[PDB]
Design a protein around this ligand. Structure first.
Ligand SMILES: CCn1c2ccc(C[NH2+]C)cc2c2ccc(-c3cc(C)cs3)cc21
Ligand SMILES: [Zn+2]
Length: 196
């Protein structure tokens, strides 16, 4: 009824990482460690790093899913709003209803869960390229947090799960997301509110 959001490194020491993009007015995606919150513009690239301490088996996958953060909305499926689900901006793979897309991975699979109706996007887990220390997935969020009839100003969390080939849990991490016009300014405002 509600997916777990408990952080779980598991046997492979799985966790996320984020770039340090700053808070200039021009920034399109920026992560706040103090808030555990990603701020991004609509349909812009959000790089999310995957870190492990040891190599998981072939066939391991990485799934992303959004849920509402507030308990009174947690059972509602997070989906694109009535406008954006009809705006014909598909990449030829993501269903138009899905909030979260993976950019530039032809092996991405999009699931409409037959029992919970929740949306998710899953890719094969891959090792870092030679010369790199981690692997990065590029996500896009396809509605604003404010979209009426959709998220409608309700905060969401993205849950990233490391899964075996059957879909069993190997690791879990999560972060709040705000999709907004000015992520740099909103990160500064919310960090100031937190300090106050
Ligand atoms: C989570 C992404 N990922 C990593 C992230 C950080 C580091 C540490 N670098 C210093 C190593 C790996 C790593 C090693 C192997 C694999 C895989 C191998 C196979 C066969 C499938 S995935 C994935 C990996
Ligand atoms: Zn929308």
């Amino acid at each position: 009824s509600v997916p777990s959001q408990k952080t779980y490194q598991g046997s492979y020491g799985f966790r996320l990482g984020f770039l340090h993009s700053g808070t200039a007015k021009s920034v399109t995606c920026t992560y706040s460690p103090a808030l555990n919150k990603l701020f991004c513009q609509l349909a812009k690239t959000c790089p999310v790093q995957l870190w492990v301490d040891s190599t998981p088996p072939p066939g391991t996958r990485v799934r992303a899913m959004a849920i509402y953060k507030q308990s009174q909305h947690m059972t509602e499926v997070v989906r694109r709003c009535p406008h954006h689900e009809r705006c014909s901006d598909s990449d030829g793979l993501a269903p138009p209803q899905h909030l979260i897309r993976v950019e530039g991975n032809l092996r991405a699979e999009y699931l409409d869960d037959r029992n919970t109706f929740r949306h998710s996007v899953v890719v094969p887990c891959e090792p870092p390229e030679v010369g790199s220390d981690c692997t990065t997935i590029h996500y896009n969020y396809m509605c604003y947090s404010s979209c009426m009839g959709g998220m409608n100003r309700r905060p969401i969390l993205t849950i990233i799960t490391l899964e075996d080939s059957s879909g069993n849990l190997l690791g879990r991490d999560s972060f709040e997301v705000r999709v907004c016009a000015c992520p740099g300014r909103d990160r500064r405002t919310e960090e100031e509110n937190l300090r106050k």
